[PDB]
Design a binder for this molecule. Structure first.
Ligand SMILES: Nc1ncnc2c1ncn2[C@@H]1O[C@H](COP(=O)(O)OP(=O)(O)O)[C@@H](O)[C@H]1O
Ligand SMILES: Nc1ncnc2c1ncn2[C@@H]1O[C@H](COP(=O)(O)OP(=O)(O)O)[C@@H](O)[C@H]1O
Ligand code: CFM
Ligand code: CLF
Ligand code: SF4
Ligand code: ALF
Ligand code: ALF
Ligand SMILES: [Ca+2]
Ligand SMILES: [Mg+2]
Ligand SMILES: [Mg+2]
Lengths: 274, 522, 478, 274
């Protein structure tokens, strides 16, 4: 048991929202989960904690003097479905270095043994712009074993997806991390499903699932909760339940096969028009 | 001018009248310096309690620190392994500094390499530098191992050392089986000693973590010893000597005494002696592991207990009388070997020296600083001697350590006026030796500037420095000394008393003034 | 001897490097030749160091804070970033000054922000602001502050110039932000450039509108002399003896006010071209002040320089110049009569930074010694162009030499003496080869001017003819 | 003349797309514009150059040895409408330090006087995660004088906008930089316009314009061009034309007035339901 996963993808593509909803589904199935927020903005746990967490590791460590004076209990909180939540934390936009904060945060979790023995899953929710080594911390040796890239039929999102695939290769070749697949978080573009499927095939992976764009997500979000909690009978709620199962039973873990910019342009022209 | 028969270097030379005249004109014409009255006024001010309070209120400014950064320690630790080349991933300016810092203390050659990451490597990452770097080092300096540590630059950008090394191997830059242990050594975390601790744990993990299956505790009948950051050659030697004298099988893990003391015989040896690879791989089979300086071997301890399953004894550094005794008795209990008549005699000789010199050492107030374990050892020994440590400063100390030092101080009547300061620097200590004058101060060469300042206030205010610690740059070959064991205690004791007697002779050398007390027999 | 054998030696040495490094290093080793006026056909310099070859090079920080700024007496220099850079470079360079350390002078002290993890993660500009306030309180006599950026400051993008401007205006003080992040450039060299630019941008123009300074036709400024062991002072006494008035010395025993007065001088005398040509060229284009390189190492060079300098003024100065030369003639002649016979014909190999590799050759020759090999840690090609004329033919030249290369070169060439840095000193002594630190003068008196030549000669002899060099081999081992 | 503006906002909100489409309209009005890409992915000038730019400042400096050997001509290209483009460049995802990349790129441009005398506008297109000091380089002293934050009715996008505003306060107080307004790049949420206007008022700025979500943007994107060039008559093409004028005539430049998390939660509850 105990599977660690990292979620990556285009900025604002919906990874923090999808993760929390996917996790709420998992807890519904009776799975024990921890979500590790790896983004300066400590917003990867609001729908689960029903509030913006304030006890972030970095801020908590700055107060206690050093991370060495910190303690799990102070930063690790349980929310909906018994889901465990921790937030790396970081500086306000435009100052400091958020990457280093993530390195420090992850090591602290590692050394405090947060990654407990009876967890079924651990999800690292990473920001969209992996602009440095610090944000690859989740996929170093003995961390996440599977990666899921969230994207959409949008040209720029698919480019970010391929681009990230390139960055994964160094880590996948030196370790055991593998790309588990692409999660299409639909944005109503034309022939969107064909686009993602073609890119997945080119990368050598699969389109795990296709989450539809549904404003119910926004209404649930406004009330600080996932769709599974907000409205269990919602059609979208079942979409996440299906995503959860696809994840749980997934056995396809490969090493990204990055394509060139030209190959990507050629792919957009072929499956993008009409 | 110069007299070819008696040439003058800068010191005597610039005291010649023409040079004095010149410097006087330089000052008055273009330096726009503050009047001498203002300078003296401000000087006096910096010696008061009012200034001291402002001084201790500092929150952002550090002045004259008593510590170095992590990588310095990682390098020293790597030098302790056979044919190992310290490799620092990051900027080359660092390595240039680590080498010359050590060159100056040991006055020996210090081999260390860098992969010179520049502007574009800080941007795109330092993986290429690692691939070409490991290949170039191996081919050029033919080491049998490359111990990798980091500069702050590589730490900020989170360069993945493990992934770079693994890919360097996967791509043929170096053989798959070539040992390349590594450690993340943040210049902004801890101090040089933390670097030593991280580097060592990283080396122990590389040779041991994946191969614990066949290991059995106590099977090789030896005792592992981890010295920690040590810059006194005599400390490595006295430990080996005492164990061998007890007929105790031991394995010193990280032993740089040979590379730091090669003979000048017409041949340069980049590598010498050092802890072998086989010794490290076999370490888990030892009966137990002893950590000589526990306060900066915290990470190592956690690894040795969790992975090796050794019940690491709770021992203080073997300095002074009581802690050396405790060390020996523990080693005897772990190895079964009795403490020999030899060591019993050595202990008795130290006690003899203590009794012979106690009247001169009694009540003498000292200010001292250094690394955690060292400083605590000195405090403990000082107390046994009947001395009064009054200002104890450890810049890289922490709260727990301070709590332990306070307990050692409270257990003795001689610790009544002592205070322990952590996170304070030599400018703070400067204030303390003015407002609460000690007879002497014990520390590294950086304290010479403090002795300089105190004398400026007046001869009666001068606080002589007693050179013990790291680094020592203004005296020669003091790195050959010993501070551990009875031997070390004997050396420290001789130095303290004779320093005291020296100063006494200086104060009473005045003829028909103070020489009435210039006794031939002390 | 014979470039044929030297070229072969170079090839033999390169045989151990992997292809990539071999091809690169090959461009940095050459056999000198007196006629080439353009060294780019012989050696390439000022390039990145090959990774893992153990070079002797430092960083931009050492170049900025270590050589250019740190010398300045009455300013407080803050090593901004983790404790470390500042600790290793504390009082390691013997740039001598006169002052009351801790009150009106701070050269020998280490001020730092001692960055901890939260300073990197959350930025340190607020810490920098508070640090400046603490400095103003504890050190009221400081006449200015500089903040020397260490590696991390360059990566996280702290806005030091903003803090410098703001606090500067608030306290009515000159606060100079220097972006000398270690990883910039490839050596100490870019740090010189960054340093010069910071002087130009934040200090030099301060008195552009002021005319209260009373100047004379004989005002000169010595720039590029860091007063190592007092080198600048023993140079200054000569210039003032021939009638010149030194209004300023750049960074050796230098003060911020004399830097601000430099734009008023009639001539800039540059000793270290590598580190100070930048500001010299700027003062010429902006203030019309001409500059000239000089060399005070040894009598032949010193006399040549005094005469060339004197020629820039009138007859009264030239007359005094001859009077100065006549005065010291007996003195240096006595130095050669005593030490030349002890040193005559001995061969030397040098490896230094960016000036001395070429500048000290004349003094060695004044003692009858020959420089068989020379090289620089971080010189540019304009430095090597000036080097080919100074070196003899078929001599060896090396740019950013590696530990392995230097060692192997010494083994074959077998020089009688080696002049380099502290990182090389103990290797060669073990090999039984007399060594002299050519950076710190091995803690010995000044080597500039006439008074320094005598100490220079005594040091070279003291070390070269010492009896220990005969005892290296145990009697019972043929 | 010569106005420097910097574009920030939530990740993937559409600031690069909007920036290029707004600049095409500006060139169409006869203005001289230069866009400076400040994202490791060099995708801020694809629609103007009709191709993914390959000559980034960082990649070009690496080849030339040092940024000191680099020359403008090598990295400065002209595209549609004569619009000049430059890309900071940076590392692939997961390694290096993209922040330093931008610091070095901007400093290079400043010294090479690329920000020539007859340009009318200069736009700094910044990534969405300003996780450090380097990405604030565009708004340091004597750089961009006005900032536009792109966002949408989405809860998370509004949070990022308020978050970036906190970061702006520092640079706005030490310099002359000011927030020029919010640009709502519609994503079809409920009462979207009301939400943005409400947040705008709270911060003390204005909602400069409302850009409808139109798949035409995507179709033109597939072909490597802005709407203005793809279909001048397109209704969306006029949207950008309007935006362009609003920007050109904008006179409201303020210092952000960030709100607390609870005020933002409250704001969402009031103008976000129904
Ligand atoms: N399936 C969906 N349907 C509708 N809106 C969605 C969906 N997924 C995400 N969103 C919206 O997108 C916004 C941003 O997504 P977010 O979870 O922050 O992703 P990222 O972590 O990549 O920024 C959320 O405020 C939400 O309104
Ligand atoms: N108004 C819009 N209508 C349709 N698609 C849009 C619109 N704005 C942005 N997009 C799409 O969203 C994706 C992200 O836009 P991009 O410019 O990369 O934003 P950012 O600069 O925040 O990454 C693009 O592929 C584009 O198709
Ligand atoms: S290695 Fe001078 S260009 Fe610079 S510290 Fe020494 S050969 Fe320097 S002369 Fe000078 S006072 Fe120097 S000796 Fe130019 S200042 S970067 Mo190391
Ligand atoms: S290349 Fe030069 S010396 Fe090196 S760091 Fe950079 S400016 Fe400084 Fe500093 S603290 Fe220690 S010594 Fe390095 S790891 Fe950082
Ligand atoms: S890009 Fe990463 S390593 Fe660089 S300063 Fe920013 S958060 Fe830090
Ligand atoms: F803007 Al994000 F994950 F919050 F890419
Ligand atoms: F996702 Al982006 F700029 F491309 F924020
Ligand atoms: Ca020696
Ligand atoms: Mg997110
Ligand atoms: Mg963008």
């Amino acid at each position: 048991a105990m599977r660690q996963c990292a979620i990556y993808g285009k900025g604002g593509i919906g990874k923090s929202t999808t993760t929390q909803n996917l996790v709420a589904a998992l807890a519904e199935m009776g799975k024990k989960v921890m979500i590790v927020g790896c983004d300066p903005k400590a917003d990867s746990t609001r729908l689960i904690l029903h509030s913006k967490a304030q006890n972030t590791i970095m801020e908590m460590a700055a107060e206690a003097g050093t991370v060495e004076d910190l303690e799990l209990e102070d930063v690790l909180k349980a929310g909906y479905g018994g889901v465990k939540c921790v937030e790396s934390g970081g500086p306000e936009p435009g100052v400091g270095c958020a990457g280093r904060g993530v390195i420090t945060a992850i090591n602290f979790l590692e050394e405090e043994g947060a990654y407990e023995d009876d967890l079924d899953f651990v999800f690292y929710d990473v920001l969209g712009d992996v602009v440095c080594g610090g944000f690859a911390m989740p996929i170093r040796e003995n961390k996440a074993q599977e990666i899921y890239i969230v994207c959409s039929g949008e040209m720029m999102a698919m480019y970010a997806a391929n681009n990230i695939s390139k960055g994964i290769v160094k880590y996948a070749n030196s370790g055991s991390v593998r790309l588990g697949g692409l999660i299409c978080n639909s944005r109503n573009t034309d022939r969107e499903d064909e686009l993602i499927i073609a890119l997945a095939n080119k990368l050598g992976t699969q389109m795990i699932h296709f989450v539809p764009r549904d404003n119910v997500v926004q209404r649930a979000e406004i009330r600080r909760m996932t769709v599974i909690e907000y409205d269990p009978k919602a059609k979208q709620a079942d979409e996440y339940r299906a995503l959860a199962r696809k994840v749980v039973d997934n056995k396809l873990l490969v090493i990204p096969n990055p394509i060139t910019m030209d190959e990507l342009e050629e792919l957009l022209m072929e499956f993008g028009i009409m | 001018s110069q007299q070819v028969d008696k040439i003058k270097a800068s010191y005597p030379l610039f005291l010649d009248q023409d040079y004095k005249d010149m410097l006087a004109k330089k000052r008055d014409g273009f330096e726009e310096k503050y009047p001498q009255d203002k300078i003296d006024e401000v000087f006096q001010w910096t010696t008061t309690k009012e200034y001291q309070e402002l001084n201790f209120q500092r929150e952002a400014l550090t002045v004259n620190p008593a510590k170095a950064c992590q990588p310095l320690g990682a390098v020293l630790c790597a030098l302790g392994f056979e044919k190992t080349m310290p490799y620092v991933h990051g900027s080359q300016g660092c390595v240039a500094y680590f080498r010359s810092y050590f060159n100056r203390h040991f006055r020996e050659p210090v081999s260390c390499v860098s992969d010179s990451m520049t502007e574009d490597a800080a941007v795109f990452g330092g993986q290429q530098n690692m691939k070409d770097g490991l290949q170039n080092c191996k081919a050029t300096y033919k080491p049998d191992m490359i111990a990798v540590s980091t500069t702050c630059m590589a730490e900020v950008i989170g360069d993945d050392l493990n992934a770079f090394i693994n890919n360097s191997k996967k791509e043929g830059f170096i053989p798959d089986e070539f040992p390349v242990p590594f450690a993340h050594t943040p210049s902004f975390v801890g101090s040089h000693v933390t670097g030593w601790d991280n580097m060592f744990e990283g080396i122990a993990r590389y040779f041991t973590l994946k191969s614990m299956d066949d290991k059995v505790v106590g099977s090789n009948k030896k005792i592992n010893i981890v010295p920690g950051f040590e810059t006194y050659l005599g400390n490595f030697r006295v430990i080996k000597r005492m164990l061998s004298e007890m007929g105790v099988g031991y394995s010193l893990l990280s032993d740089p005494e040979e590379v730091l003391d090669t003979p000048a015989d017409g041949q340069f040896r980049m590598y010498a002696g050092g802890t072998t690879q086989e010794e490290m791989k076999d370490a888990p089979n030892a009966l137990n592991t002893v950590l000589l300086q526990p306060w900066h071997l915290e990470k190592t301890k956690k690894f040795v207990e969790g992975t090796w399953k050794h019940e690491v004894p709770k021992l203080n550094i073997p300095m002074g009388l009581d802690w050396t005794d405790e060390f020996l008795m523990k080693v005897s209990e772990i190895s079964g070997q009795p403490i020999p008549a030899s060591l019993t005699k050595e202990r008795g000789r130290l006690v003899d020296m203590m009794t012979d010199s106690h009247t001169w050492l009694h009540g003498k107030r000292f200010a001292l600083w250094g690394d955690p374990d060292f400083v605590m050892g000195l405090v403990k020994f000082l107390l046994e001697l009947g001395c009064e440590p009054v200002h104890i400063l450890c810049h890289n100390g922490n709260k727990r350590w301070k709590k332990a030092v306070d307990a050692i101080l409270a257990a003795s009547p001689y610790g009544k006026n002592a205070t322990v300061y952590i996170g304070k620097d030599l400018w703070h200590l400067r204030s303390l030796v003015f407002t609460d004058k000690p007879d002497f101060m014990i520390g590294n060469s950086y304290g010479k500037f403090i002795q300089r300042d105190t004398l400026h206030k007046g001869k009666e205010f001068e606080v002589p420095l007693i050179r013990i610690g790291f680094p020592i740059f203004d005296r020669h070959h003091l790195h050959r000394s010993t501070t551990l064991g009875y031997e070390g205690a004997m050396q420290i004791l001789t130095t303290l008393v004779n320093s005291i007697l020296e100063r006494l002779d200086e104060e009473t050398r005045g003829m028909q003034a103070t020489d009435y007390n210039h006794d031939l027999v002390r | 001897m014979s470039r044929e054998e030297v070229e072969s030696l170079i090839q033999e040495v390169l045989e151990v490097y992997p292809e990539k490094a071999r091809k690169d290093r090959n461009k940095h080793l050459a056999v000198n030749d007196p006629a080439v006026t353009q060294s780019k056909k012989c050696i390439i310099s000022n390039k990145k160091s090959q990774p893992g070859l153990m070079t002797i090079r430092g960083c931009a920080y050492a170049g900025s804070k270590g050589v250019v700024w740190g010398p300045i007496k009455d300013m407080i220099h803050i090593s901004h970033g983790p404790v470390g850079c500042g600790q290793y470079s504390r009082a390691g360079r013997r740039n001598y000054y006169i002052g009351t350390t801790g009150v009106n002078a701070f050269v020998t002290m280490n001020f730092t922000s001692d960055f901890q993890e939260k300073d990197i993660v959350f930025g340190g500009d607020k810490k920098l602001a508070k640090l400046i306030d603490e400095v103003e309180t504890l050190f009221p006599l400081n006449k200015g502050i500089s903040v020397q950026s260490e590696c991390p400051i360059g990566l996280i993008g702290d806005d030091i110039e903003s803090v410098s401007k703001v606090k500067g205006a608030e306290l009515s003080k000159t606060i100079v932000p220097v972006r000398c992040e270690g990883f910039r450039g490839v050596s100490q060299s870019l740090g010189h450039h960054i340093a010069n630019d910071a002087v130009r941008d934040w200090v030099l123009g301060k008195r552009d509108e002021d005319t209260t300074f009373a100047s004379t036709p004989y005002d000169v400024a010595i720039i590029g002399d860091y007063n190592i062991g007092g080198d600048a002072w023993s140079s200054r006494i000569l210039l003032e003896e021939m009638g010149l008035r030194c209004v300023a010395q750049w960074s050796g025993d230098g003060s911020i006010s004399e830097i601000e007065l430099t734009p008023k001088v009639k001539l800039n005398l540059v000793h270290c071209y590598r580190s100070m040509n930048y500001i010299s060229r700027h003062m010429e284009e902006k203030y019309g002040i001409p500059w000239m390189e000089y060399n005070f190492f040894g009598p032949t060079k010193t006399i040549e320089s005094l005469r060339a300098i004197a020629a820039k003024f009138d007859e009264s100065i030239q007359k005094k110049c001859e009077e100065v030369i006549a005065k010291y003639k007996p003195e240096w002649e006595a130095v050669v009569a005593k030490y030349r016979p002890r040193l005559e014909g001995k061969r030397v190999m040098l490896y230094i930074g960016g000036l001395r590799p070429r500048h000290v050759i004349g003094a060695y020759e004044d003692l009858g010694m020959e420089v068989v090999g020379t090289g620089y840690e971080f010189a540019h090609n304009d430095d090597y162009d000036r080097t080919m004329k100074e070196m003899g033919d078929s001599t060896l030249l090396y740019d950013d030499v590696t530990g392995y290369e230097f060692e192997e070169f010494v083994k074959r060439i077998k020089p009688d003496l080696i002049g380099s840095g502290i990182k090389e000193k103990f290797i060669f002594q073990k090999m039984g080869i007399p060594f002299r630190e050519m950076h710190s003068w091995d803690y010995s008196g000044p080597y500039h001017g006439f008074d320094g030549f005598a100490i220079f000669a005594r040091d070279m002899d003291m070390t070269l003819n010492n009896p220990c060099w005969k005892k290296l081999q145990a009697p019972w081992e043929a």
